[PDB]
């Protein structure tokens, strides 16, 4: 089975947050629990009744044929929790297995046919993922900031102006909030078109229909790869500056052994009448006091914080004298991509890269040395070697459209030149509903 | 009436080409070209002059202005005091400033109420245009034609570029156009007439 | 492909003169490309040939 293929399943909290209220609002019976005594025909009856391919989990060991039915019709099982999930299924294959799941986002549009009750997409989830865990006080701050950008007076908002208790502050957080009638008991009643007004059935994140329309475009812009230019991680490595392209990441050579960085690895140790910052190498446990003579290591550094200066310096020394490759995944940076004539207006010490604050954005520059003309045949030889340490871990130049608009040999293309993408130029056409479209490819 | 929209002409996009040239390169062979063709193809052939080392597609800084609190100078939106630690000053160059930035992009696009009105427009007489452009042009165009690489066809000295672009445009899957084009909304009234450009 | 004529912008050039004995240490190493000549005064090609 392919990675898309398998048995879809989501945690209850996810189900409750999203699919359930939509089920209530669309007037369908609550989807059935699956005891494992459950017949596949029962599940089909339920998926008929709910107009959604969902079932809630109930109790241990789902029977085989019902499970095969869950797989064939892409029914979304809703697990109370993910612990020991495989025990819940009777896999005759014994092929179902923990850590064989593929976690992924799933748009609500994919499971609901009722288009009116769906506004956003995978995009907003993907953007919430970039966001820090948010205190309610931080949320209020964010809101008030957005307000001041838009010039509104948000004073006393989310507050109580009591005469005797003074001003008080309630939380402004209300993800997926709905207007619902409550019982005098204070508990919520399920929305009833019979008495509650129709405008109330589904608050659309409290936005105008137009703002939702634009919101879709914007979510498409924000999740677009070209705009995403806050790069993560740097690979430190000691090579001659050969490759012209900015997006270069040197390959790790065949003999290297990956080693997760940990404070445990480096230790002060006596060696030849002094206290070398010895590094013991985990495959063999051999201790190497000198930066030189250490085995080729591809040391990943997940967390720069708490690294000793003697140790940061020792790692970089090992990068040079023993040719270590040192990925440093904790760095977030923006990259300007300088042309050869503008050189390197900014310069960075290894010490700064090994000791930047964990949240601050570094600003690296990278040469695109492609537009650099051949040396005169009589220029004096360069005895010494140009050398380079810092590299991107993933591609930069995601924003690039064109490159090297100059001829090579007056006809032949330069290696590394890039023509603009074809999609820049398809002044397509409107769809019958006024959406933009690319021109049809082939026919019809 | 409520001013529900901001009527404007020759609209800003959310994205703009931005280019770096190594200025020592310059083709010896100057390209005298038609006057009317240079007022269409022109802003492009200047934006992608010989020696452009790189052409990027950035957020339009002129649109996502400092008025929205965004700074696009470092290549990502960066908004100053949205997501912040409380009880301490946030510090400079925070990475959260990027996430805040996307919100202010997402916000600013959510509320772009611009409504295009047709701006000043030329109707070149056609014999006055080289055929590659005349095939692209559709009757009329705004004088601020703006930039598009498809315009570089049969104009840029840089041969591989012209060969590859002509190679793209001659495929069925892509077909560039400019200015007035027929649309389902043509002739529709709303005080004035709707048109498609 | 043409041989360059205008004076090009070369990377900065460290000249770590190397003696009989020395204490190499690599804190404050430059990370951007940086040429590393060993001898002082390499401009030895002085006899120009018209």
């Amino acid at each position: 089975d392919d990675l898309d293929e398998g048995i879809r399943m989501t945690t209850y909290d996810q189900y409750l947050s999203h699919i359930r209220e939509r089920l209530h609002i669309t007037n369908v019976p609550d989807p059935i629990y699956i005891t494992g005594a459950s017949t596949p025909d029962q599940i089909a009856a339920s998926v008929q009744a709910t107009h959604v391919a969902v079932v809630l989990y109930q109790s241990g060991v789902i029977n085989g044929p019902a499970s095969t039915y869950l797989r064939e019709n892409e029914v979304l099982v809703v697990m109370p929790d993910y612990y020991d999930v495989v025990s819940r299924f009777a896999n005759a294959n014994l092929q179902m297995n923990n850590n064989r799941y593929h976690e992924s986002v799933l748009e609500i549009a994919d499971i609901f046919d009722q288009a009116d009750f769906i506004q956003t997409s995978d995009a907003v989830r993907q953007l919430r993922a970039l966001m820090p865990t948010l205190s309610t006080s931080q949320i209020r701050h964010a809101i008030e900031r957005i307000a001041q950008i838009t010039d509104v007076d948000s004073t006393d908002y989310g507050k109580l102006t009591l005469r005797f208790l003074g001003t008080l502050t309630r939380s402004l957080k209300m993800q997926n909030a709905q207007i619902r009638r409550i019982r005098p008991d204070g508990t919520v009643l399920r929305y009833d078109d019979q008495i509650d007004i129709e405008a109330f059935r589904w608050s659309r994140y409290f936005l105008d229909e137009l703002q939702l329309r634009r919101l879709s475009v914007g979510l498409r812009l924000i999740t677009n790869p070209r705009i995403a230019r806050r790069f993560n991680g740097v690979r430190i490595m000691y090579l001659t500056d050969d490759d012209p392209d900015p997006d270069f990441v040197p390959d790790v050579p065949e003999g290297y052994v990956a080693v997760q960085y940990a404070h445990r690895l480096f230790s002060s140790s006596l060696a030849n009448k002094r206290n070398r910052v010895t590094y013991t190498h985990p495959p063999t446990g051999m201790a190497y006091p000198s930066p030189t003579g250490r085995p080729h290591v591809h040391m990943t550094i997940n967390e720069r914080a708490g690294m000793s200066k003697l140790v940061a310096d020792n790692i970089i020394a090992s990068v040079i004298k023993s040719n270590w490759v040192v990925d440093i995944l904790d760095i977030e940076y923006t990259a300007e991509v300088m042309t050869p004539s503008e050189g390197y207006t900014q310069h960075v010490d290894a010490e700064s890269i090994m000791t930047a604050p964990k949240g601050k954005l570094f600003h690296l520059q990278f040469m695109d040395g492609l537009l650099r003309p051949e040396p005169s045949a009589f220029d004096p030889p360069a005895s010494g070697e140009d050398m380079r340490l810092i590299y991107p871990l993933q591609p930069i130049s995601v924003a690039r459209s064109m490159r090297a608009i100059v001829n090579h040999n007056e006809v032949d293309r330069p290696r590394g030149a890039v023509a603009p993408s074809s999609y820049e130029m398809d002044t397509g056409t409107l769809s019958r509903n006024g959406d933009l479209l690319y021109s049809p490819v082939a026919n019809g | 009436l409520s001013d529900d929209f901001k009527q404007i002409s020759d609209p800003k996009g959310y994205l703009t080409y931005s280019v770096k040239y190594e200025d020592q390169f310059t083709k010896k062979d100057k390209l005298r070209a038609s006057e009317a063709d240079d007022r269409i193809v022109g802003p492009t052939v200047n934006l992608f002059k010989y020696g452009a080392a790189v052409v990027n597609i950035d957020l339009n800084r002129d649109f996502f202005d400092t008025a929205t609190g965004i700074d696009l100078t470092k290549g990502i939106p960066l908004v100053q005091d949205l997501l912040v630690p409380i009880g301490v000053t946030a510090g400079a160059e925070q990475s959260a400033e990027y996430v805040s930035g996307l919100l202010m992009v997402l916000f600013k696009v959510m509320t772009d109420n611009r409504l295009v009105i047709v701006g000043e427009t030329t109707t070149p007489m056609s014999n006055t245009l080289s055929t590659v452009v005349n095939n692209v042009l559709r009757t009329t165009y705004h004088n601020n034609v703006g930039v598009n690489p498809a315009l570089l066809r049969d104009f840029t000295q840089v041969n591989w570029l012209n060969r590859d672009i002509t190679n793209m445009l001659q495929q069925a899957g892509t077909k560039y156009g400019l200015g007035l084009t027929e649309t389902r909304l043509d002739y529709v009234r709303l005080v004035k007439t709707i048109v498609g450009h | 492909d043409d041989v360059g004529i205008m004076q090009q912008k070369k990377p900065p050039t460290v000249v770590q003169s190397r003696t009989d004995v020395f204490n190499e240490q690599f804190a404050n190493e430059a990370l951007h490309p940086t040429t590393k000549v060993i001898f002082n005064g390499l401009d030895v090609n002085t006899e120009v040939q018209p």
């Binding site: 042309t339 | 770096k20 190594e22 800084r61 | -």
Partner: peptide, 26 residues
Amino acid sequence: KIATASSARQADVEKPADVTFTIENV
């Protein structure tokens, strides 16, 4: 003379819509 880099980005020219008093059609 020394080699030199330069940069350019397409300018905004968006303007509030003109208030013409003349009309195109009858």
